[PDB]
Motif scaffolding. Structure first.
Motif, mmCIF file in Angstrom:
data_model
loop_
_atom_site.group_PDB
_atom_site.id
_atom_site.type_symbol
_atom_site.label_atom_id
_atom_site.label_comp_id
_atom_site.label_asym_id
_atom_site.label_seq_id
_atom_site.Cartn_x
_atom_site.Cartn_y
_atom_site.Cartn_z
ATOM 1 N N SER A 1 0.764 -1.107 -0.017
ATOM 2 C CA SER A 1 -0.061 0.058 -0.012
ATOM 3 C C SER A 1 0.917 1.347 0.100
ATOM 4 O O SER A 1 2.112 1.348 0.168
ATOM 5 N N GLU A 2 0.446 2.403 -0.174
ATOM 6 C CA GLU A 2 0.785 3.737 -0.128
ATOM 7 C C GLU A 2 1.737 3.885 0.989
ATOM 8 O O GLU A 2 2.882 4.390 1.051
ATOM 9 N N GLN A 3 1.142 3.630 2.169
ATOM 10 C CA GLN A 3 1.718 3.701 3.529
ATOM 11 C C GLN A 3 2.899 2.663 3.394
ATOM 12 O O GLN A 3 3.928 2.954 4.029
ATOM 13 N N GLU A 4 2.499 1.415 3.152
ATOM 14 C CA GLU A 4 3.870 0.420 3.065
ATOM 15 C C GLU A 4 4.878 0.675 2.394
ATOM 16 O O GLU A 4 6.131 0.529 2.731
ATOM 17 N N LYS A 5 4.617 0.874 0.910
ATOM 18 C CA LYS A 5 5.488 1.270 0.031
ATOM 19 C C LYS A 5 6.450 2.356 0.582
ATOM 20 O O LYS A 5 7.486 2.650 0.212
ATOM 21 N N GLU A 6 5.898 3.071 1.607
ATOM 22 C CA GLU A 6 6.699 4.113 2.323
ATOM 23 C C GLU A 6 7.975 3.436 3.047
ATOM 24 O O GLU A 6 9.204 4.427 3.186
ATOM 25 N N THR A 7 7.785 2.265 3.571
ATOM 26 C CA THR A 7 8.990 1.621 3.930
ATOM 27 C C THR A 7 9.952 1.171 3.008
ATOM 28 O O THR A 7 11.168 1.376 3.058
ATOM 29 N N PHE A 8 9.580 0.282 2.229
ATOM 30 C CA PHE A 8 10.415 -0.431 1.102
ATOM 31 C C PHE A 8 10.724 0.527 0.038
ATOM 32 O O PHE A 8 11.994 0.458 -0.343
#
Length: 68
Positions: free
Chosen positions: A21-28
């Motif tokens: 997700s947009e928030q997950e992609k934030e980490t990777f």
């Protein structure tokens, strides 16, 4: 190596391997962004997401936004 280095940032993005997700992609995206073209550390801190298995993060991001 293989003594003092265990995976962490992932336990929350464990449901990213099949949906970054947009928030997950934030980490990777941050690690891969921090590490200009590396696909080693980025896919090493979020264990669940391997280097070859991380490819599922890039082709998914542009599988709806088309930001290529």
């Amino acid at each position: 190596n293989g003594l003092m280095a265990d995976p962490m940032k992932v336990y929350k993005d464990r449901q990213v391997m099949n949906m970054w997700s947009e928030q997950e992609k934030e980490t990777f995206r941050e690690k891969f962004m921090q590490h200009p073209k590396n696909f080693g550390l980025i896919a090493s801190f979020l264990e669940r997401k391997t280097v070859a298995e991380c490819v599922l993060y890039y082709y998914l991001t542009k599988k709806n936004e088309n930001y290529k």
